[PDB]
């Protein structure tokens, strides 16, 4: 029979609102003394309280900033700013949309075979390099690209060691010039400066050694395990593009240079940017390469000339996840592998809350790609670039806080974009503004007359 | 089954010398067995690395060994309007050692060589060289079949045919019972690989000091090829001898070519004229099938059987994953003129990166039951990775899959325990053949004695 509004003290309008969100207060002075002032809105109208005199705050959610989601500044969350107005112990819901607009981060590190056999292939690896940079930059604005070069272990019999002039110029005996031999050179750290990367790639020239199989696997291992030097990012797709026109040296080959120490799988580049253990440590085995590529989360692509495609296809089957493309005057084959790799990238939208007041609590409903409402969930997975998800958030306040104006943020993990929610707490009635300081009606040490009542 | 792992004898070399990289038993004319140990990074008398050889007398307590002297001085000879030059720095003397009768043969696979003529040269290259010593007389000789006096330009004009400049002769070695030294030279013919054979008697009788280029008329070298399957095959990386054509008058050679055919790898059985009798192809690319080869009759039928090691073989495992563990292949010789078929047994390593099959040694009959036995080294095997040697006993069916005994390295990490192995000789005269295990990383050698 009796309700909570009528049966709980209610000396004033303010106390009435604090009881429950369903309570209303009548300020009509024509209302008789028998009728309660704090009651359900239905019970007041039914008891002839004037519709204008009824106080019944309704919680609202107004959008303030509603810049639309971007297509192709960048807006990925919509809306951006909301004003929640809450009465005591009440709640209110609101919607948020989140779209993956920004391109996914991809690291490409390019390994150039600069041995003498590559003289006729030099243009092709420069073309490929600059096309990698230029075209993948069109595909993703979050590309970082860098490179290094290799020949082989600078030690006899791989290296020409006579006459003395052959050391600085391996091409001495052909009456021409080329660069000194070297194992692996890190040349350019992963950078977003595409123009610069292209300029350096175009400056590269060949060196020379004696035996056809080369030391690229030393380079692959060091490109994989030298984290800081190469510059791989923690939350980026990592692609290692390896180029050559020949066979490769493998673990246990190094004994022909008197080198028997097994590869340790550790970084040995450092200050001068050369592989320092090139002449003292054996080539890595396929199994060790596999382990480090997996441990560092790097995808190896062999970009090799047609004469050795079958060779590297066959090594590829022994290092799972590795792919083979054809190095030629045409960049398309290898580029397709990278574009295909980019097409397999998926992302998540996981909402996190910041600066949430003690008094407020939130509950979330997620609507992901399946177009079905998963209640209590605040994250979606499996998004591609351009996909959109939506959440419904309900904020509930505990009682009435004295602060009266607070703010919090709702933000997807790894996004710049966020929703700022400004919260206002509406605990007072409008009739309190017309408080009338003088008593007039009470006149027995009470004071003030608000909303049609004494103390 | 019956090697004693508690009472080991340790012999030690100098720090950094790689003492134990190679080893063999050596029996003097009296019959007393010693141990020859190669130490390819031993410092010479001027503090430059030359390598060296040590001759260890048998002692239960072990210890230090006397160094078998060789000439470590570079040579120059101005003759025929040319300048011949030997270079012994970093030559790796003792990278292989082998004993036959009263002779020790220690090789230096990275000994370098050049020939100058006016402004031209042959090129300074690792032809390798073997040093021969007869300890009970002091006689010394050398053998360096890959040295030439052809200039660089001529190889270019002939498209690099018969290019023996990078042989590394002595990289592997073996001696037949009749006293023919056979050297593997995996850098031969521009890294195809070659074999060089000459009788030990003729090496001694044709050598004089200071000549540098001389003829051993009885010598016999294998042939060059234009077949790309052989390119960079390192034919000669390992070598052994045996009886595989049923004619006891002839001797057959077994040659490992671990990177043959684009790193598939191969082992070949050849006659003494180097005609191929059979080829055994590797199973998996880059596994280094042919790294080690061993010849011994393991099933008691009197016909030699072949064992091949592929120490970087990757075993298939759950969810399409591969694990580098190494593998050894056993080929039993069948009756009559039939070919060696598929393997009778496959032994596969269990420890990741263990390199099982990095060395394979015939033990003779370790337990005297009638069937010969073998030991296989996994130099980085065992749970801790310190190294392991596994003994397999022979039987009518071939070898047992389960090892009879496991020898764990008594040396610290990095020792390469097992990288070199030799058995089939009774060092302490107890009637049972014993085992010697090199640990070059620890500059030591361990001797295990077989007990009743």
């Amino acid at each position: 029979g009796p309700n909570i509004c009528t049966t709980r003290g209610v000396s004033s309008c303010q106390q009435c609102l604090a009881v429950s969100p369903m309570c209303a207060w009548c300020s009509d002075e024509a209302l008789p003394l028998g009728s309660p002032r704090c009651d359900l809105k239905e019970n007041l109208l039914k008891d002839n309280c004037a519709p204008e005199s009824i106080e019944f705050p309704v919680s609202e959610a107004r959008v303030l900033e509603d810049r639309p989601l971007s297509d192709k500044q960048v807006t990925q969350v919509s809306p951006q700013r909301i004003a929640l107005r809450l009465r005591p112990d009440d709640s209110k819901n609101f919607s948020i949309q989140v779209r993956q607009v920004e391109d996914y981060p991809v690291d490409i590190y390019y390994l150039m075979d600069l041995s003498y056999s590559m003289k006729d292939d030099l243009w092709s690896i420069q073309n490929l390099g600059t096309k990698l940079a230029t075209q993948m930059r069109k595909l993703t604005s979050n590309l970082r690209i860098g490179f290094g070069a290799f020949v082989d272990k600078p030690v006899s019999p791989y290296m020409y060691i006579s006459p003395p002039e052959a050391l600085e110029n391996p091409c001495y005996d052909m009456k021409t010039t080329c660069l000194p031999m070297f194992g692996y050179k890190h040349v350019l750290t992963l950078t977003d400066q595409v123009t610069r990367f292209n300029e350096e790639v175009k400056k590269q020239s060949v060196s020379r050694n004696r035996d056809a199989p080369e030391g690229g696997f030393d380079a692959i291992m060091q490109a994989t395990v030298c984290d800081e030097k190469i510059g791989w990012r923690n939350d980026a797709s990592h692609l290692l593009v390896f180029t050559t026109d020949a066979k490769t040296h493998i673990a246990l080959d190094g004994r022909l240079a008197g080198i028997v120490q097994p590869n340790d799988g550790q970084c040995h580049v450092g200050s001068d940017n050369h592989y320092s253990a090139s002449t003292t440590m054996d080539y890595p085995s396929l199994g060790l390469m596999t382990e480090k590529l997996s441990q560092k989360n790097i995808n190896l692509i062999f970009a090799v000339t047609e004469n050795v495609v079958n060779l590297y296809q066959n090594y590829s089957e022994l290092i799972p996840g590795t792919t083979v493309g054809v190095l030629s005057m045409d960049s398309s084959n290898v580029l397709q592998l990278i574009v295909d790799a980019y097409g397999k990238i998926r992302s998540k939208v996981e909402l996190e809350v910041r600066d949430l007041p003690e008094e407020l609590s939130l509950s979330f409903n997620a609507t992901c790609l399946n177009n079905e409402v998963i209640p209590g969930l605040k994250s979606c997975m499996g998004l591609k670039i351009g996909d959109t998800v939506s959440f419904s958030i309900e904020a509930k306040v505990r009682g009435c806080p004295q602060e009266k104006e607070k703010s919090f943020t709702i933000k997807p993990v790894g996004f710049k974009d966020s929703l700022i929610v400004q919260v206002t707490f509406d605990c007072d009635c409008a009739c309190q503004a017309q408080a009338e300081p003088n008593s007039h009606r009470c006149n027995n040490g009470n004071g003030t007359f608000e909303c049609g009542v004494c103390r | 089954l019956n090697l004693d792992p508690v009472q080991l004898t340790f012999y030690a070399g100098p720090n950094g010398s790689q003492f134990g990289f190679s080893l063999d038993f050596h029996k003097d004319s009296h019959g007393r067995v010693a141990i020859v140990v190669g130490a390819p990074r031993t410092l010479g008398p001027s503090q430059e690395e030359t390598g060296g050889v040590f001759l260890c007398p048998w002692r239960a307590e072990g210890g230090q060994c006397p160094s078998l002297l060789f000439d470590l001085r570079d040579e120059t000879r101005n003759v025929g309007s040319q300048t011949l030059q030997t270079f012994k720095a970093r030559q790796g003397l003792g990278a292989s050692v082998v004993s036959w009768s009263d002779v020790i043969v220690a090789c230096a696979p990275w000994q370098h060589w050049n020939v100058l003529e006016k402004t031209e040269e042959a090129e300074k290259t690792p032809v390798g060289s073997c040093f021969l010593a007869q300890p009970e007389s002091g006689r010394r000789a050398e053998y360096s079949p890959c040295r030439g006096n052809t200039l660089s330009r001529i190889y270019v004009e002939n498209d690099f045919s018969w290019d023996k400049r990078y042989c590394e002769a002595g990289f592997s070695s073996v001696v037949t019972q009749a006293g023919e030294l056979v050297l593997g030279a995996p850098g031969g013919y521009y890294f195809l690989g070659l074999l060089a054979q000459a009788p030990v008697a003729d090496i001694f009788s044709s050598y004089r000091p200071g000549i540098l280029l001389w003829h051993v008329s009885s010598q016999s070298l294998s042939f060059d090829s234009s077949n790309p399957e052989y390119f960079d095959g390192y034919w000669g990386y390992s070598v052994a001898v045996g009886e595989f054509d049923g004619d006891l008058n002839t001797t057959e050679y077994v040659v490992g070519a671990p990177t043959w055919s684009w790193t598939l790898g191969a082992v070949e059985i050849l006659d003494s004229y180097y005609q191929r009798l059979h080829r055994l192809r590797g199973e998996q690319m880059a596994s280094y099938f042919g790294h080690s080869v061993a010849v011994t009759d393991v099933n008691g039928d009197g016909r030699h059987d072949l064992l091949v090691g592929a120490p970087l073989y990757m075993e298939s495992r759950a969810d399409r994953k591969l694990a580098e563990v190494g593998r050894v292949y056993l080929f039993l010789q069948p009756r009559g003129p039939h070919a060696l078929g598929a393997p009778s047994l496959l032994l596969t390593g269990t420890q990741l990166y263990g390199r099982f099959g990095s060395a394979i040694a015939p033990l003779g009959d370790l337990d005297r039951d009638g069937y010969n036995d073998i030991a296989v080294a996994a130099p980085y095997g065992g749970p801790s990775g310190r190294g392991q040697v596994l003994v397999f006993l022979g039987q009518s069916e071939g070898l047992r899959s389960r090892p009879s005994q496991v020898l764990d390295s008594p040396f610290p990490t990095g020792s390469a325990f097992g990288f070199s192995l030799r058995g089939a000789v009774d060092i302490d005269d107890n009637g049972y053949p014993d085992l010697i295990v090199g640990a070059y990383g620890a500059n030591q050698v361990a001797v295990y004695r077989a007990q009743p």
Binding site: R210, A212 | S161, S226, D232
Partner: peptide
């Protein structure tokens, strides 16, 4: 320089 050991087996 035709087929009997003749080759282009180096870094060429």
């Amino acid at each position: 320089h035709h087929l009997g050991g003749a080759k282009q087996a180096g870094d060429v």
